[PDB]
Write an enzyme that holds these catalytic residues in place. Structure first.
Site, PDB file in Angstrom:
ATOM      1  N   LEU A  30      67.671 -20.148  25.747  1.00  0.00           N
ATOM      2  CA  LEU A  30      66.957 -20.898  26.736  1.00  0.00           C
ATOM      3  C   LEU A  30      67.663 -21.659  28.048  1.00  0.00           C
ATOM      4  O   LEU A  30      67.465 -21.543  29.185  1.00  0.00           O
ATOM      5  N   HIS A  31      69.029 -22.138  27.351  1.00  0.00           N
ATOM      6  CA  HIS A  31      70.098 -22.579  28.362  1.00  0.00           C
ATOM      7  C   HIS A  31      70.785 -21.303  29.108  1.00  0.00           C
ATOM      8  O   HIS A  31      70.897 -21.509  30.314  1.00  0.00           O
ATOM      9  N   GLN A  32      70.807 -20.337  28.745  1.00  0.00           N
ATOM     10  CA  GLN A  32      71.130 -19.227  29.483  1.00  0.00           C
ATOM     11  C   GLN A  32      69.992 -18.273  30.121  1.00  0.00           C
ATOM     12  O   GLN A  32      69.989 -17.388  31.062  1.00  0.00           O
TER      13      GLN A  32
END
EC number: 3.1.-.-
Lengths: 189, 293
Positions: A30-32
């Site tokens: 999700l962060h990437q």
């Protein structure tokens, strides 16, 4: 009150890891997948959150636009988890959605880092820097954390995130870097 | 006919320690002079293992013997119980071959179960399997681990060929030595995951490595026959079939699906269970262990 496109993510069990490690690796996805993807009006919702159990979630409930969720289903970067977890399809949202709060907020429960910068800036001593910082300035936040044991410290760590209150009225806003609330609410059902 | 007070089965499917060496993709066919991945320290003080900054491919190599003769124990008190056991196992093999177990073993060598966390989040994983008779190569297989599913055991021509090789190995009809080499695109300078010692990391002479019993854990994930739920997936074959990470013990002895209960009811009393439970019991005999009182 207008974003009625959801993208759910159901979590199945696997023998090589528990749901906490899958929540950490999916947190990296999700962060990437959002920070390295693009789209401010795309948030996520954790429906199995419990502040009395320290859990993170038993089923992901994504919230995006029509094309914001219609172009992320065919993600080849979303592969791998297709063998580990399960997916769904797009579905409409109801009219009255309760305004909930889910976002990221970092707390400072350690005076040793500010004692390092305070030793490099204030010039504190052992007893003067150790006594200038009281013992009550540190506190552990017992929110739902994620063991994001990446390549900064080798041991397992915790996760920090602050949620908001519950409400009924709609107050939309721009999502954060991880698809959370930072001044705009999100529906919770 | 009481049970034997001493039983012990030597293991078959004996793996070795896997070695990790990093390199560049599309320099993949010449993966013979690649340098090893070393374990280093960084600051509490931990150990990490990373790829070099100009390499994005992990290479994991190990070997595997398939011994065969999976009914004869190595230690047994009674002589009547041992002969009854050999008649039971020989009855099983004569009724149906080792095709099911070697098919599931072939599926666990097909994908990359033995890449435990290194598989998670990779662009392409390629598995190359060689069969060895002399200082030569008899037949080579080249698979694709991401196309082959993690939970769905679907047939294929090449998996039927390699399942005929393993099934020909476990029956004692020949000598089977396999060389397994796995390739994974992770990224430039990313982190690899060797096995952890009792944060120290396991190593050999200046190379990171994985223990042999962890690969051996990854090969024997057969059991899709839990009483509780067949929706999660196959987790490995144990008596009192348990998962240490989940903290749960499926296949309770309060039920009648335990290995000791099925083995006692099928050797001593001739009460043959269902066919899939017979696959479970013979899978525990291929696993080996210390049985009896």
């Amino acid at each position: 009150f207008t974003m009625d496109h959801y993208l759910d993510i159901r979590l199945r069990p696997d023998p090589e890891f528990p749901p906490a490690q899958l929540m950490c690796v999916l947190f990296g996805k999700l962060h990437q997948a959002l920070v390295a993807q693009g789209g401010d009006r795309i948030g996520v919702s954790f429906p199995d959150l419990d502040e009395s159990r320290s859990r993170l979630g038993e089923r992901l409930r994504i919230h995006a636009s029509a094309d914001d969720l219609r172009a992320l289903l065919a993600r080849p970067w979303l592969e791998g988890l297709r063998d580990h977890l399960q997916f769904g399809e797009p579905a409409v949202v109801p009219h009255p959605t309760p305004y909930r709060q889910v976002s990221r907020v970092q707390a400072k429960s350690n005076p040793e880092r500010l004692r390092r910068r305070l030793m490099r800036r204030h010039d504190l001593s052992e007893e003067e820097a150790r006594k200038r910082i009281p013992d009550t300035v540190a506190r552990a936040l017992d929110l739902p954390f994620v063991t994001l044991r990446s390549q900064s410290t080798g041991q397992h760590f915790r996760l920090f995130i602050r949620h908001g209150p519950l409400q009924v009225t709609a107050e939309e806003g721009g999502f954060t870097c991880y698809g959370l609330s930072k001044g705009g609410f999100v529906p919770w059902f | 006919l009481s049970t034997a007070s001493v039983l012990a089965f030597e293991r078959k499917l004996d793996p070795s320690d896997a070695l990790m060496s990093a390199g560049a993709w599309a320099q993949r066919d010449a993966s013979q002079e690649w340098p090893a991945v070393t374990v280093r320290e960084k600051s509490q003080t931990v150990d990490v293992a990373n790829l070099p900054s100009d390499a994005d491919t992990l290479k994991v190599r190990f070997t595997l013997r398939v011994l065969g003769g999976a009914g004869t124990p190595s230690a047994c008190n009674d002589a009547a119980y041992r002969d009854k056991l050999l008649q039971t196992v020989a009855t099983y093999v004569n009724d149906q071959g080792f095709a099911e177990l070697a098919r599931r073993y072939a599926h666990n060598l097909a994908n990359a179960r033995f890449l435990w966390r290194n598989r998670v989040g990779a662009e392409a994983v390629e598995v190359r399997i060689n069969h060895i008779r002399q200082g030569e190569v008899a037949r080579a297989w080249r698979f694709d681990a991401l196309a082959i599913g993690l939970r769905d055991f679907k047939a294929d021509a090449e998996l039927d060929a390699l399942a005929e090789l393993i099934a020909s190995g476990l029956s004692g009809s020949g000598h089977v030595l396999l060389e397994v080499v796995a390739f994974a695109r992770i990224g430039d300078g990313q982190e690899v995951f060797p096995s952890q010692e009792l944060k120290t990391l396991y190593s050999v002479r200046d190379a990171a490595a994985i223990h042999s019993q962890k690969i051996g854990n990854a090969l024997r994930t057969i059991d899709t026959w839990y009483p509780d739920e067949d929706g999660l997936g196959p987790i490995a074959v144990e008596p009192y079939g348990s998962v240490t990470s989940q903290g749960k013990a499926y296949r309770q002895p309060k039920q009648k699906l335990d290995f000791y209960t099925l083995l006692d009811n099928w050797v001593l009393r001739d009460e043959a269970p269902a066919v899939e439970q017979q696959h479970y019991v013979i899978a525990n005999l291929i696993r080996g262990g210390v049985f009896g009182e």
